[PDB]
Amino acid sequence: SDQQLDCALDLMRRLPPQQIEKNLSDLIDLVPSLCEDLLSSVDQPLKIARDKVVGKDYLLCDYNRDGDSYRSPWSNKYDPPLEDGAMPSARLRKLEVEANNAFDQYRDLYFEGGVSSVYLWDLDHGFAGVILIKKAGDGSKKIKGCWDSIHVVEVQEKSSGRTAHYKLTSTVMLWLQTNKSGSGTMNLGGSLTRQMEKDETVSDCSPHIANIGRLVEDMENKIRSTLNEIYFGKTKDIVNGLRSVQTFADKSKQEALKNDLVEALKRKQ
Amino acid sequence: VIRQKEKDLVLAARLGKALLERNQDMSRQYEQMHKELTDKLEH
Amino acid sequence: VIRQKEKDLVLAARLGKALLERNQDMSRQYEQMHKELTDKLE
Amino acid sequence: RVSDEEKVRIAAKFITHAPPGEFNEVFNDVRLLLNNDNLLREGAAHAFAQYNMDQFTPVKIEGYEDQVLITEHGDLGNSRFLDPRNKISFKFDHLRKEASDPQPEEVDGSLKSWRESCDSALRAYVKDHYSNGFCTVYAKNIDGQQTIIACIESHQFQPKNFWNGRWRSEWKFTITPPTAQVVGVLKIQVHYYEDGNVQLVSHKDVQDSVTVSNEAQTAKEFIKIIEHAENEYQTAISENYQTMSDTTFKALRRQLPVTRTKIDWNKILSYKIGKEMQ
């Protein structure tokens, strides 16, 4: 049933990014023996939890999925009440609380709201973390958007000397809508994923978390940019290439002179 | 064969892991050589 | 039973071989960096 | 465990949301998955009928070289859509994507004059603004009302360039002679997946009216309303794409912060910016 899995992933690849959760559950309802085989490479939105003791929010994924509970980084507690989970290193717990702090600053600077979370775990010669960012559109506004970001980062620290090897994998799951009069309703799905790795020197002024912050910042700038120009301009190009606004036989004139100049440019070769 | 490929495929994996550790020890000494070169750079 | 072991262990030994490719790229880039470290020393 | 009757709703859900130009691939990924061609045979056959009747599927007519469109508004049961052009009935295999039985449809006669009249004017319009467009006009005496259901469809299926797109357009030319409230819809679905995945789904609920003055006048006038709304809609869509870096995305994620600078991570981590002080 391995070909069945390949076609299943391609089906999710071509599936409409509006009902990712429901249709993923449906596809799992086909072959439930292949269920938690798909929940590793099928990108879907996030789940907002609620830290009761702190009064914050924290997102849900597999990295915080300790057993079947979730480690709330604002409290380092598990919900459902599992007092047998895998607590992170106390060292990494302090590094994680400052990580959550720095990314709250990051999130507030670019997203001006939204929910974020940064979990962490070990490595033999380093550590690794995940960065969840979920920005839903302004509910008051008509723009029904939902920015979703997941950043798999793996700090492969070298021997000593404080130089590292920062491996990072990201993912953006966009969502957009406008109920504008000129467009009626213009829905706009979309999703990206990239990888980047750099070896920035670690120091007392340049900790690991700062290097990760620069990488996440650059990565999201590239993804948002890349999206907006390449992919969205590509869609605009497709709509313009399908139907043209200019009347034909006028386009035959401009394309006529265009082919004339094609002959002119390829005439003096 | 179930058993014979168990022996040889896990053996190829064991030898592959041994070669992994060979390149690992190489890389260990490589970063040791790296830090030595940086020590000279420091001087 | 059989093909499970065949697929998983052939590609698993080749996953360790993927780590061999990884480690080979590690050694390659390390020696290139050694050349560059010597360049800075020069 | 899930029953078999729910698989029909599942396959229907996967076919009714298949992007244009990618139906066969959804079929392969559902044939090699549902494992019972009988269940998806009946259920998915109805789903195929839906997916091919709604999206104005391009069907080839081998006799007159026209490539007419199958619109939901015309049928006689066993894929017996009534081709308005050439007055021929036809069967069609939704999967083979090949029509059958070009029997010369003995149409009862509803609005055949309007059919080829507004069809002709729309053929001129399609040959003006649509590159690979296709026109089809359904004439019907629906529930005691004469109407023209002019449909427009254009598409580009380029799998080597990892994209698709199917401009679909319907115009219920409601032949309510004193006030033709020409209300239709222009739904668009565009997919692009080169090294990623992007889907554009839109539609404009066009609403316009005009008195059915004459036939040729309302034919080209129907084209006037059509050219108006379509030039308007395509242009407006392009400018929505123009004003997206600073408005829609800024609703989601700004390009740069409000301070118009990068982040001094060394500053935030080194000390608290003074957020404790207010």
CATH of the domain at D8: 3.30.1140.60
Q: d(Cα D135, Cα D150) in Å, to the nearest integer?
A: 7
Q: Which of B35, B23, D266 is nearest to A162 (CA)?
A: B35
Q: Of D76, D107, D138, which residue is a domain's last?
A: D107
Q: What are phi and psi of A213, to 5 degrees?
A: -65, -40
Q: d(Cα D250, Cα A138) in Å, to the nearest integer?
A: 10
Neighbours of A220 (CB within 10 A): 23
Does D235 lie in the same domain as D142? yes
The answer to whether residue A106 neighbours chain D at the CB level (below 8 Å) is: yes
Return the structure tokens found at A165. Answer: 């090897």
Instruction: Examine residue D180 and state whether it is found in any structural domain, yes or no.
Output: yes
Neighbours of D77 (CB within 10 A): 6
A100-103 long-range contacts, Cβ below 8 Å, gap at least 24? A100/A73, A100/A74, A102/A209, A102/A213, A102/D265, A102/D268, A102/D269, A103/A131, A103/A133, A103/A213, A103/A216
Quick one: closest CA in B to A158, which residue? Answer: B31
Q: Of A38, A56, A88, which residue is a domain's last?
A: A88
Q: Of D49, D78, D107, which residue is a domain's last?
A: D107
Q: d(Cα D187, Cα D56) in Å, to the nearest integer?
A: 11
Does D113 lie in the same domain as D91? no
Method: cryo-EM
Does D129 lie in the same domain as D86? no
Does A113 lie in the same domain as A37? no
Instruction: Examine residue D55 and state whether it is found in any structural domain, yes or no.
Output: yes
Strand D69-70 and strand A191-198: pairing? unpaired
Does A61 lie in the same domain as A19? yes
Does D128 lie in the same domain as D91? no
Return the structure tokens found at A92. Answer: 């990494």
| Contact across the interface for A159 and B38, Cβ inside 8 Å | no
Instruction: For an interface test with A, give the residue of D253, D256, D259, D273 to mutate (most A CBs within 10 A).
Output: D253
Neighbours of A38 (CB within 10 A): 16
Gap from A140 CA to chain D (nearest CA, Å): 11
Q: d(Cα A39, Cα A12) in Å, to the nearest integer?
A: 12
Instruction: Examine residue D266 and state whether it is found in any structural domain, yes or no.
Output: no
Instruction: Examine residue D8 and state whether it is found in any structural domain, yes or no.
Output: yes
What one-letter code names the amino acid at D229?
Answer: A
Does D128 lie in the same domain as D101? no
Q: d(Cα A223, Cα A236) in Å, to the nearest integer?
A: 18
Tally of structural domains, chain A: 2
Cβ within 8 Å of B, C 3-42: 5-6, 9-10, 12-13, 16-17, 19-20, 23-24, 26-27, 30-31, 33-34, 37-38, 40-41
Q: d(Cα A224, Cα A226) in Å, to the nearest integer?
A: 6
Q: What is the CATH number of the domain that holds A60?
A: 1.20.58.570
Name the residue range of residue D214's domain: 108-252
Broken C–N links (> 2.5 Å) in chain C, after residues: none
Quick one: closest CA in B to C31, which residue? Answer: B30
Q: Which of A134, A111, A122, A130 is nearest to A48 (CA)?
A: A134
Q: What are phi and psi of D189, to 5 degrees?
A: -135, 120
- CA–CA–CA angle D255, D260, D266 (5° rounding): 100
- The alpha carbon of residue B41 and the mean position of all alpha carbons in its chain are separated, in whole angstroms, by 28
Using an 8 Å Cβ cutoff, are A64 and A119 in contact?
yes
Q: d(Cα A147, Cα A174) in Å, to the nearest integer?
A: 5
Instruction: Examine residue D264 and state whether it is found in any structural domain, yes or no.
Output: no
Name the residue range of residue A142's domain: 89-269
The answer to whether residue A83 neighbours chain D at the CB level (below 8 Å) is: no
- Cα–Cα distances (Å) from B36 to B26, B30, B32, C35, D31, in that order, read 15, 10, 6, 13, 61
Residue-wise DSSP of D196-265: SBEEEEEE---EEEE----SHHHHHHHHHHHHHHHHHHHHHHHHHHHTTTTTHHHHH--SS-TTSS---H
Does A265 lie in the same domain as A150? yes
Q: d(Cα A238, Cα D261) in Å, to the nearest integer?
A: 35
Which sign does the torsion angle of CA D29, D30, D33, D37 carry?
negative
Q: d(Cα A34, Cα A27) in Å, to the nearest integer?
A: 9
Q: d(Cα A215, Cα A195) in Å, to the nearest integer?
A: 10
Please measure the distance between the N-terminal and C-terminal CA atoms of chain A and give it in whole angstroms: 58
Does D114 lie in the same domain as D100? no
Cα-based torsion angle of the residue sequence A52, A58, A61, A66 in order, rounded to the nearest 10 degrees: -40
Does A165 lie in the same domain as A256? yes
Does A166 lie in the same domain as A129? yes
Q: d(Cα D194, Cα A127) in Å, to the nearest integer?
A: 33
Strand D134-140 and strand A65-66: pairing? unpaired
Half-sphere exposure of D110 (CA within 13 A, CB side): 21
Q: d(Cα A105, Cα A224) in Å, to the nearest integer?
A: 19
- The alpha carbon of residue A94 and the mean position of all alpha carbons in its chain are separated, in whole angstroms, by 25
Does D179 lie in the same domain as D61? no
Using an 8 Å Cβ cutoff, are A156 and A125 in contact?
yes
Does A70 lie in the same domain as A96? no
Using an 8 Å Cβ cutoff, are D92 and D80 in contact?
no
All residues of chain B having their beta carbon less than 8 Å from the beta carbon of residue A159 are 31-32, 35
Resolution in A: 3.5
Contacts of C37 (CB under 8 A, 6+ apart): B34, B37, B38, B41
Q: Of A49, A70, A88, which residue is a domain's last?
A: A88
Does A126 lie in the same domain as A80? no
Quick one: closest CA in A to D20, which residue? Answer: A14
Q: d(Cα D11, Cα D33) in Å, to the nearest integer?
A: 10
Residue D190's Cβ-count burial label (10 Å; 0-12, 13-18, 19+) is buried
Q: What are phi and psi of D57, to 5 degrees?
A: -65, 130
Q: What is the CATH number of the domain that holds D123?
A: 3.90.1150.210
Does D83 lie in the same domain as D128? no
Using an 8 Å Cβ cutoff, are D190 and D200 in contact?
yes
Q: d(Cα D216, Cα A35) in Å, to the nearest integer?
A: 60
Q: Of A88, A114, A141, which residue is a domain's last?
A: A88
Gap from A243 CA to chain D (nearest CA, Å): 5
Q: d(Cα D206, Cα D226) in Å, to the nearest integer?
A: 9
Return the structure tokens found at B21. Answer: 């550790």
Q: What is the CATH number of the domain that holds A227?
A: 3.90.1150.210
C14-17 long-range contacts, Cβ below 8 Å, gap at least 24? C16/B13, C16/B16, C16/B17, C16/B20, C17/B16
* H or E element at residue A219: helix A208-226
Half-sphere exposure of A246 (CA within 13 A, CB side): 9
Using an 8 Å Cβ cutoff, are D209 and D218 in contact?
no
Q: d(Cα A220, Cα A106) in Å, to the nearest integer?
A: 11
Contacts of A95 (CB under 8 A, 6+ apart): A120, A127, A208, A209
Contacts of D230 (CB under 8 A, 6+ apart): A243, D129, D169, D186
Does D113 lie in the same domain as D102? no
Residue-wise DSSP of D136-169: EEEEE-GGG-EEEEEEEEEE--BGGGTB--EEEE
* Residues listed for chain A: 269
Quick one: closest CA in D to A222, which residue? Answer: D255
Is the bond preceding A80 in cis, omega lying within 30 degrees of 0?
A: yes
Q: d(Cα D254, Cα D252) in Å, to the nearest integer?
A: 7
Does A102 lie in the same domain as A40? no
Q: d(Cα A120, Cα A76) in Å, to the nearest integer?
A: 11
Does A9 lie in the same domain as A140? no
Does A49 lie in the same domain as A100? no
Residue A215's Cβ-count burial label (10 Å; 0-12, 13-18, 19+) is buried
Tally of structural domains, chain D: 2
Does A239 lie in the same domain as A172? yes
Does D96 lie in the same domain as D134? no
Using an 8 Å Cβ cutoff, are D26 and D15 in contact?
yes
Contacts of C15 (CB under 8 A, 6+ apart): none
What one-letter code names the amino acid at A114?
Answer: G
Does D130 lie in the same domain as D51? no
Q: d(Cα A100, Cα A91) in Å, to the nearest integer?
A: 14
Does D226 lie in the same domain as D118? yes
Q: Which residues pair with A127 in a beta bridge?
A: A122, A155
Does A94 lie in the same domain as A130? yes
Return the structure tokens found at A111. Answer: 């997203």
Cβ within 8 Å of C, B 2-41: 2, 5-6, 9-10, 12-13, 16-17, 19-20, 23-24, 26-27, 30-31, 33-34, 37-38, 40-41
| Contact across the interface for B32 and A160, Cβ inside 8 Å | no
